[PDB]
Symmetry: D2
Subunit: 430 residues, 4 copies
C-alpha cells in the first residue's frame, strides 16, 4: 500500500490552487453586488468560462471518452483545492460533472460521441444537470407501495411525453432559463399520470432517463417547460437549482438514455454513488479553509494576553479535533474513489464504501467549521473573516447529494442487511 503522490497528481494540485487563487478569488466582487440567486449565478459565467479555458470541464470526462480526467484521486485533489478558496463556479463545475455521469456511465459510444461533444471542446460555457430531485422529495422514490417520482414519462408514438416537476437540480435552467446544454431527466414511467403508481410493481423497473438539450426545449411549446422559481439558499449563494414544470413535454426517442427499468435505475444509482464519494472532497475544502484560517489566527494572536492563543489547551484541542477530522476525511475519500475504480470488487462493496464516505466527511465537516469558530471566538462571527460564508456553505453537504438521514444511511443499511455482505471486502478482498 502506498500514499505517495505522482508528479501529475502534484501538478493537478498546483494547477487548481493557481486557478482558484488567481481567478476565483476575483469572483466575489462580481456576485456580491447582485440581488438574487439567479443574478448571482449569472455573474459567475465569466469565471466558468475561465474554468473551461483552463480545461477543468474537460477534466470532468474520462480520457477514453476524449476528456482529460487522469483518475478520481486527481479529481479529489482538484475539488478540495477549489472549495478551500471559492465554492462559487466550483459548484457549477461539479454539477455539470454529475450531469455528465449518466452519459459517462452508459455503455453506448454513439450517445457518448454526441452528447459529450461540447463539454470536451475547451470552449463555450456548457452546463449539464442531473435532474432528479422533486418538490415532494425523493428519499423514498423506490419504495414499493408509494407515490414514486412525480415527474412521469409515457411513450406517445415515436417520442416521449414528460409531466411533473423537479426542484434543486443544479444548472437545470442553464445560464438563461432556456435550459442546460444537457440535462438527464429521471422519470417514473406511467401511462396515465393522474393514476397512482401500481402498488404491486417494483418501482425500480419503471425508471426512465431522458436527455433534454436546449433544442428539445426550443422544439416545444413555451409553456411545456416553465421555471416556477429559484430557491434562495443559506449558502452556495451563486448556484442555480430551479423549480421546473414539464407539461406535455415532447422528447425524441433518440434521446432516451437506455431501455427503461432496472438498467436506468442502476445508472442513476451508479451516478449518485460516485459523486457521493467525491462530495467529501468538497466538504474537506470548506473545512480545510475554516481550520487553516483558525490555525493562523491562533498562532499570530494573543487575544489580549501574554502568549499566542494556540498555547491554551482548549484552543489547541479544537484545532487538534479539526485536523483529525480533516485527515481522516481525506483518507476515506481517497479510499472510496480507489474502491470505485477497482474492477475486481462487487458493486455492493463499492456502494457501501461510498455511503460511509459521504456520511462521515459531511457530518464531520460541519463539526470542524463550528469548532474552528469557537477557537477564534467572537471575531469569527463577522463577515470580515470567512467563517460566516463557511458556516452556511458547510451545512449544505450533509443535506444535499442525497441527505444522510433519509438516503445515505438507508442505502448503507440495506447493503449491511444482505446475507452475503462482506464488511471488509474493500480492504482485505473476498
Amino acid at each position: 500500500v502506498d500514499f505517495k503522490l505522482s508528479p501529475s497528481q502534484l501538478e493537478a494540485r498546483r494547477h487548481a490552487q493557481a486557478f482558484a487563487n488567481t481567478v476565483l478569488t476575483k469572483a466575489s466582487a462580481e456576485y456580491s453586488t447582485q440581488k438574487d440567486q439567479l443574478s448571482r449565478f449569472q455573474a459567475t459565467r465569466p469565471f466558468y468560462r475561465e474554468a473551461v479555458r483552463h480545461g477543468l470541464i474537460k477534466a470532468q470526462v474520462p480520457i477514453p471518452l476524449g476528456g482529460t480526467m487522469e483518475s478520481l484521486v486527481h479529481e479529489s485533489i482538484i475539488l478540495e483545492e477549489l472549495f478551500a478558496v471559492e465554492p462559487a463556479t466550483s459548484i457549477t463545475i461539479v454539477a455539470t460533472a454529475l450531469g455528465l455521469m449518466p452519459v459517462i456511465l452508459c455503455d453506448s459510444p454513439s450517445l457518448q460521441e454526441k452528447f459529450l461533444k461540447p463539454f470536451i471542446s475547451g470552449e463555450g460555457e456548457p452546463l449539464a444537470s442531473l435532474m432528479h430531485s422533486e418538490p415532494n422529495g425523493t428519499a423514498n422514490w423506490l419504495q414499493k407501495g408509494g407515490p414514486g417520482l412525480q415527474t412521469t414519462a409515457r411513450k406517445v408514438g415515436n417520442e416521449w411525453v414528460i409531466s411533473g416537476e423537479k426542484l434543486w437540480p443544479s444548472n437545470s435552467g442553464g445560464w438563461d432559463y432556456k435550459g442546460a446544454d444537457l440535462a438527464c431527466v429521471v422519470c417514473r414511467v406511467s401511462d396515465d399520470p393522474s393514476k397512482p403508481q401500481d402498488p404491486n410493481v417494483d418501482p425500480a423497473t419503471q425508471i426512465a432517463v431522458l436527455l433534454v438539450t436546449r433544442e428539445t426545449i426550443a422544439n416545444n411549446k413555451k409553456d411545456a417547460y416553465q421555471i416556477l422559481g429559484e430557491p434562495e439558499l443559506a449558502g452556495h449563494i451563486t448556484t442555480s437549482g430551479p423549480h421546473t414544470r414539464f407539461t406535455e413535454f415532447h422528447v425524441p426517442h433518440e434521446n432516451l438514455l437506455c431501455t427503461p427499468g432496472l438498467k436506468a435505475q442502476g445508472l442513476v444509482e451508479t451516478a449518485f454513488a460516485m459523486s457521493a464519494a467525491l462530495v467529501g472532497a468538497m466538504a474537506i475544502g470548506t473545512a480545510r479553509a475554516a481550520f487553516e484560517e483558525a490555525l493562523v489566527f491562533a498562532k499570530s494572536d494573543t487575544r489580549g494576553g501574554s502568549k499566542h492563543i494556540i498555547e491554551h489547551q482548549s484552543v489547541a484541542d479544537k484545532l487538534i479535533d479539526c485536523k483529525i477530522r480533516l485527515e481522516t476525511s481525506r483518507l476515506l475519500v481517497w479510499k472510496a474513489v480507489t474502491t470505485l475504480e477497482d474492477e475486481a470488487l462487487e458493486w455492493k462493496v463499492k456502494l457501501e464504501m461510498a455511503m460511509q464516505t459521504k456520511i462521515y466527511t459531511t457530518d464531520v465537516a460541519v463539526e470542524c467549521v463550528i469548532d474552528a469558530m469557537k477557537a477564534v471566538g467572537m471575531k469569527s462571527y463577522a463577515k470580515d473573516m470567512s467563517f460566516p460564508r463557511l458556516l452556511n456553505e458547510v451545512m449544505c453537504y450533509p443535506l444535499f447529494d442525497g441527505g444522510n438521514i433519509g438516503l445515505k444511511r438507508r442505502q448503507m443499511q440495506r447493503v449491511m442487511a444482505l446475507e452475503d455482505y462482506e464488511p471488509w471486502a474493500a480492504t482485505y478482498g473476498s
Copy 2:
C-alpha cells in the same frame, strides 16, 4: 421543590407571545429591505418603541427601583418567547438590560435614581449598553502580567479622560451614532496611556467603570467620540455593536460608578454572570423554533413515501435529541436564575451555576438546530423556511456574552479549583 407556574408567570408568557406575534412578526418586512447592519438596526426603531409601549424595557428594572421585573423566572419565560419568534428588537431589549445591570447593582441610590429614570418612564426609545469588549478581545482582561484592557481612563482635575477603542457592545452608539442614552464604559485606570500595564499590580484593582450619556457625548469635541465601523454579523443581522474610538474623552467625576478596583470589577463580574444565566433563554428560544418547525413538518410530510417522516426511527431520534436538549436547557436556566436570587448562597456558587448554564445551553442549541435541519433534509436549506436564519442566529450564543472557550470555562475552572469549592451547595446547601 415545585415546578408550577403562577398566574403572573403565565401572563408574562401570554403577554410576550402576544407581543412577538402581533408586533415582532412585522419587523422583517421593514429591515429585509435595508442594505447594511446599521440601516437594518434603524428600521428596528419603530419596534423598540412598541416594546417600550408594552413596558418591556420597564420590566428590565427591579420593582425596588420603580421597574416592573417580577422575577428572573418571569424574565426567562419572556426572553424565550420573544426569541422563538424574532430576535430583532428582542436583542436590543436584552442589551439595554445588560447596560443597566451595573447601575442596578451598585450601592448608590442617587446614581440609580438619576440614570435609570428614562428606562422606567414608558416613553421614547431609551437605549443602554455595557461597553466591555475591545478589538484585541478580553478573555484575558484580568491576567496579571498582561496588557490588560486597552481602554484606559486617567484623572485630570475633577473629570476623567478616556483613551482607547471598544468593539461589539450592543447599542453603544445609540440609534444615530450620537450614542446610547446610558453607557457603562469599563476602563483600566492608567496615568500614562502609552505605558504598558504594570505587571506587578493585580489587574482587578485597576478597573473603573464610567457612565457615558448622550449629554456627555455632546459636551465633547466631535473627534473625541468616533464610530470607526459597524461589523457585518453572520446572524442577528439587525443589531449594532459598533467600533468606537475614545480620543481624549471628558467625563464628569460625578459619573464614576463606584470606587475603582475590586468593587468595579465585582460589578462587571456580577452583571455579566447574571446575563450569562439569562442568555440560555435566548438560546432555548431560537432552538425551540428550529425544533417546532421541524416537528410540525415531521408530522405532516411523507417526503414522497407512504408514512409521515416522523415514523422513521432516524428522524424521530433527531427530534427526541432536540427535545431532550431543550428541556434540560430550560430546567438549567430556571435553576440558574433561582440560584442568583437565593441570598443564602456564597457568590462563587452562583458564579458556578451561571457559567455552567451558559456553556451547556448555548453549545447544545447549536446542535439542536442542526439536527432539526438534518431531520427536515434539503428543504431546511432554503430561505422559505426559518432554518437559514436560525442557523446563523444560533451560532452567536456560544460565542457572545463571553465566549464559552475563553471565558466561561475559565471562570468555572477557577471556582472548582478553590480549596472550599462545594459542587452541590446550590442543591444541598452548605
Copy 3:
C-alpha cells in the same frame, strides 16, 4: 417554581448517606470472596437485612398503603446517595420497589393489604420482583402480528397455568431459588401455546399479570418451576436476575392482578414509566462517584508537574462536562418525578417526560464516567480506584429497565407521533 428542599428531604439524604457509609461499605468485604453471582447475592443478605431494619423497604411503599414513602423527590435523593456509594443491596431495594409497583398502582385495596404486608412490616428480608423480560427479548412485546411474550398463561378450572421462560428479572428467585416473596409475572394469554399469537388481535388485550409467592411455588411439582441459570454480569455483580422456566405451573385465580387485557398492560406500562424516571438517580449516583473521585484527585495531584492537574485546561474541561451532565441529569429527574405526581396532567405527557429522562440520564452518565477516567489518566484503570467498578456499573443503565434504543426511544416516538401531542404541556400546562 421552587428548588429548595424541605427539612424532611434533607433528613432523607442524611439518613441515606449515613446508611451507605456505615453499612453498605462493609459489603465488598463479604461479596469479594464469593465466586459467582448467586454467592455474591447471598452474601448481600445481611446488608438488605439492615436496609429493612432502617426502613428502606418500608419507604418504597406509599403512605396511604401503610408504608413510609414521603415523595418521589425523597426517593430520588435517597437512591442517588445509595448509588453514589454502593449498588449492592441498593439495586435489590429498587428492584423490590419495581416488583411492588403493579400492586401499588392497582386500585384493589384488599389485594394490596394482603401482598404489601411483609414489605411494610420492617422485619425479615422480603424480596419482590417484576418478572417481564425474556430470553427472546421484549422490545417488540406489543408488536401486532409479532410472536409476543413467550411466557403464556391459560385458564383451567379456577386456576391459571403458566408455561415459558423469563430472564433478567431482579430478585425473581429469592435468596434461595425457591422464589421471591412476591413476583409479578407478565403473561400473554393463550389457550394453546403451541400455536403462534393471533396476528389479527392487538397484543395489549392479551396481557395478564399473575402474582406468584413462595407458597405458590411450594404448591407445584419440582420441575414446574426451574432456575436454569444465573447470567454473570459485567457490573452489578451482586444482583440476581435468573433464567426461569415455568412448565405447567399452576396459579390460583385469586392471584390474578386484574382482568386480563388493556387494564393489565396499563399497569405494566405505568410501573416501568415510573421506574424509568427514577433510574436516573441511580445513574447520577454512579456518575457522581466518578466525578467526585476525579475532582478530589485533580485538586490534590500534580502528576509530576509543578501545579495541580485541575489547573490544566483540558482536565478542567472534562470535569466541567461531568458536572454539567450531572446537574442537568438531577434537574431532569426531579422534573420527571414531579410530572408523574401532577394529577392534572395526561398520562401521555408523563410518559414522554419519563422516557426523556431515562434516555438522557443513562446515556450521559456513561460519558461522565469515561471523561472522569480520562482526566485522572492511567490510574483510573486500576482496582485501587473506583473507576473499574463504576465503568462496568454505569454501562448497565442505558441497557436496562427497557433499553434506550429498543424501548424508551420507541415509546417516546409513539407519543410525539400522536396527533394531539403537546410538547410543553409538562411545563406550560394544557
Copy 4:
C-alpha cells in the same frame, strides 16, 4: 496512491488469524482459573512460548537486525488480527516490541548484536520492557521547572547507580519477578538523588536509558530490586506491569544505551511515537470484535419481533457509526505507519501524524464498543457474550501508551505551535 495488499501482507493476515484461532482461543481456559494479575500472566507463558515458535517475536525486529519484520503495515495487520480474538499474550508481544525499540533505534551495532540476540533466536520465552512510567506519573517529565522523573541515575566510578520507582511497564519483572530479559530503564541524571532537578537545566538534557537484564539483577544485592506490587487492572487482566523499586542499583557503564541528554530523550520519544501509531491497530482489533459480534447478532436475531433487528433504523445507525469509526481508524493507522517509514519527511511531521492516530483510534474505539452494546441491548451485559471483556479492554487504550489528555494532545499541540508547522506535509509533501 494505492490500497492493494501484497501476497506477503495477506499471508501475514492469514497466519495471524490461524495463530489467534488455534492457539489464543485456548488461553482463557488457563488464565480464568487463576487468582490475581501475576498468576493469570504466568498461565500465559505456554502461549507466548507458542508465539515465539510461530516466529511472532522475531517479527518484532527488523530484518537488517536479524529479525523478520517485513513492514509496519504487516505489523498493523498482525496486531489487528491478534487483538480481535485475544489480547492475552498479544499484549505481551507488543510490550516486548516496545521494550526492544530503543535498542532497535540506537545506531550502535554491538549493543544491537548483544541484547537482541535472544528475541531473534526463535527459542525460549524472552521478554523485554520499556520502563518509563512512574507512581507520580510522567506526563510532565520534560517540564522545565518540574521535579522530573523520580528514577534517577548517578555515575559512581565505572558504573551507574539507580535510585527510584517504576510503575506500569509491561513485562518489566519477567515471568518470575527476577526481571525482564531486557529492561530499558529510563532515568533522570542526578549526582545527588535527594536534590530537586535544577530548574535552570532543560530536563531533556538529563535523560539516560540504562539496559537491565536478568544478569544485571543477579549481580546486585537482593533488595536493590524489589517488586512492590502488581496493579489489579480493569481489562487486559493477564498482563504484568509491576511496581518496582530500585535502591542503589548497580549497572555497568557499557549497558548505557547512548550519551545522556537530547540523544537519549530522542530514542524514548521515537519508540513511543512509533507504538502510538501501532496501538491504533490494537484498538481496531478490540472494536472490530465488538462490531462483528453485534453485526452477526443483529443480522440474525429479531428480539421477539418479526424482522431481524438490523431492519430497525436506530440499530442500523449504531452499526454504521461503528463501521465508519473502524474504517477511518485503519486508514489513519496505515497512513501513520507509512508516514513513519518515509525517509523524506521530518520528524515533527511524523510525530504529529502518530499523535493524531493514537488520539482518534483510541478515543473512537470506545464509542464503537459502547454503540455495539446498545445495538445488541441487554444481552451484551452478560459474559456469555464478548462485550463485557471488550468494554474493559477498550478503556485501556486512550489512557495507556501515553494518555491522550496529558501527553498526546500536548505533544501534538507543541508541534502545531511551531513557526514552521506544515499541516499537510505528510499528504502533499514538503
